[PDB]
């Protein structure tokens, strides 16, 4: 099909990986920002958040419903990761 590439974002739904759930947009909303909203730590404590069960950015904005899981660290990857940003 036509590959989906930001086609009038959406109102999704982002599970936490402890069950809980949470409302998101497609194109609009990240595995950051969610994490984020909780109490500040909790993605300062972050790495590799994974959508629908597969690597995500937490610079990329999810894409619909899938489910959100913070990753403890890094497990055997290179390249893949986020890119030290301007100011730190």
Not at 33 to 50: E, F, R
């Amino acid at each position: 099909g036509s590959s989906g590439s930001s086609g009038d974002s959406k109102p999704i739904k982002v599970t936490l990986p402890d069950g809980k759930q949470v409302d998101a947009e497609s194109w609009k909303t990240t595995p950051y920002q969610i994490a984020c909203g909780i109490s500040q730590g909790l993605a300062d404590n972050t790495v590799i958040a994974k959508v629908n069960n597969v690597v995500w950015d937490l610079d990329r904005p999810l894409e619909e419903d899938c489910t959100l899981e913070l990753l403890k660290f890094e497990d055997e990857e290179a390249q893949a990761v986020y890119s030290g940003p301007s100011s730190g």
